[PDB]
Design a protein around this nucleic acid. Structure first.
Lengths: 189, 190, 190, 196
DNA sequence: AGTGAGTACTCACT
DNA sequence: AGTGAGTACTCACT
């Protein structure tokens, strides 16, 4: 109800040019058009607010990923879509990206970053499962170690999101993706 | 100065420790330095300037070593490798300073600092871009991909490795497994 | 409300006390009110704003009663008399606020405030310059002096009295001996 | 030499301290650091000429006192006429003030707001002395010219001094715009009119 | 509305 | 160069 009102606002702010700095509960209570006192009648703490966004993020990405695995059988085609998914989500959610990159959580309690870490651990496991299965599905595996291959993929992704935030959202992740994919693909050897 | 350097040295140390995940208050800083909060403003006008010094130290150290690699290596691919390895290596032996490079430690300071960091990254990219453009003259053949698209591709990998380095509280060493990683980057040199 | 005015009142009281000769830090002001400093910013953005309210109060209380004097009384010499008494009276009644009229209490605050106090005096001298010129308008005679010089001369007096009032730690009350002083002023209305 | 050299600097500081007090930055704390800059030494270097900052204003106030007092005793000699003496003494107050805008911020008590209260007390004694002196002039009028004054001698001095203090206050408020000694010849006639 | 501990920065004497 | 005590103002939770 109002709980979503807040979150939706916390993000919009997290996306604005003011998201690059502490988002006080007061300045937040204003965006919502209520009082700080109200805020705490929906959330036990500011931390819980971020925890809910992290949960949303995790849900959107994990769900989308599992669907990708059902709609596509090709090992490579799978990765291509999974990478585009991350880049796409990030681009479509600048504010939530500041959470993915960890920047926004700098003002919050550390435990929240551990959460984003697990999210990533979860995304890596998937990427790893996909390549691990190329063997059964295509007969031949990979030259490079599977684990190392997924980190290389993930690394490119975090890096693209990191830059996206640096430039203040001027450097769009999905830009020239069609031309970039051939480069990442040339790594799956 | 001795004290000026002594402060900056503690700044980075604090950025490397657990305290790096939070704001570096002039209080705690002076605590670690072993002086009075006022002593700080004796060698530095503002806390912001302290970060500016660190940024310059990063700028210089990186640009300097990059230019040395360019003068000591004529191979386009070997140049690219050493440059990428230098970015990573620096990051690993300067956990505190890396937290700046990634932009995390700059969240509590003046936005201008980030712009400074963006200029560095643009400067580093230009170097990668010049190195790629020269392969045509030097080795004759050019690159399938787009020179500009290739630098951003290499850069992305590097910013990605430093990002995770910070997330894991410095457990994921950037240079670990680099030799087995490089061949993957070499492949993108289409 | 119950707290905004409550703060302002404690602010003037400190301006009236011996502390009034020393900057009124938010730390002390908070103590005097019996709350935490933060609480102060719950009803006031900046300490400067607290002085603004106090200045507006002075501006209103004065400009108001002055006009009423011009509306009710119509005798020139009687008008000037009452205007002077009002200035002194208000001063004596508001020791702390007088410390602002003189500009002392504003030495630690924004330079803008002094301007707000300077304009008030300008407005006051204005009213005076008006009554002095209307002399020929009603009595058909003119002062053997410059109307502008006359008001300034009268104002000068008043400012001097409030000035001494402050210096003396509020021992030299402004209104004391007024009834025997006025003749000295009237004598100037040649 | 050595002593006259330290006094050349001890007084060199003051020359700067007042200079700053005269400037537009006079309406705000004149910290030691900034002061040492006006001249070219360090904090510790400043303290080898003065025990503290207070002691700096004292010497400045002392200078103030000497100027007015001395210049006043001389006024009493080179002039016997009561009214003529009052016209001068007043002109001296308004003059010394306009001639040293930085020091006036000290007379008006403004610049002192930053310093220790005991310093304002010293200025309070100065005014009292100038008033007692003014009171003397008014009293002697009788012996000198036969008659005295209608109003009380004390009330008359305060009335005149109030005008002065008031003139110096505007001079500071307008940021040294409203010059005191402006139209003195025109104003005085208004002041004498009170000498009844 | 109210606050505990904080937040980068300052000053006169050292 | 070094600091004890400031300074005006802030914040997430009350």
């Amino acid at each position: 109800n109002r709980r979503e009102e807040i979150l939706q606002s916390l993000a919009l702010m997290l996306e604005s040019s003011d998201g690059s700095q502490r988002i006080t509960t007061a300045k937040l209570a204003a965006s919502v058009g209520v009082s700080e006192a109200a805020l705490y009648r929906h959330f036990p703490s500011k931390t819980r607010m971020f925890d809910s966004l992290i949960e949303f993020i995790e849900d959107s990405l994990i769900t989308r990923i599992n669907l990708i695995l059902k709609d596509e059988k090709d090992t490579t085609a799978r990765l291509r879509l999974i990478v585009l998914l991350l880049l796409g989500f990030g681009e479509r959610n600048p504010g939530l990206t500041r959470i993915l990159t960890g920047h926004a959580l700098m003002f919050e309690q550390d435990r929240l970053q551990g959460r984003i870490n697990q999210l990533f651990e979860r995304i890596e496991a998937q990427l790893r499962q996909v390549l691990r299965e190329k063997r059964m599905r295509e007969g031949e595996g990979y030259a490079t170690d599977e684990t190392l291959l997924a980190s290389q993929i993930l690394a490119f992704c975090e890096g693209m999101l990191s830059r996206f935030v640096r430039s203040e959202f001027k450097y769009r992740p999905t830009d020239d993706f069609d031309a970039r994919w051939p480069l990442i693909a040339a790594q799956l050897q």
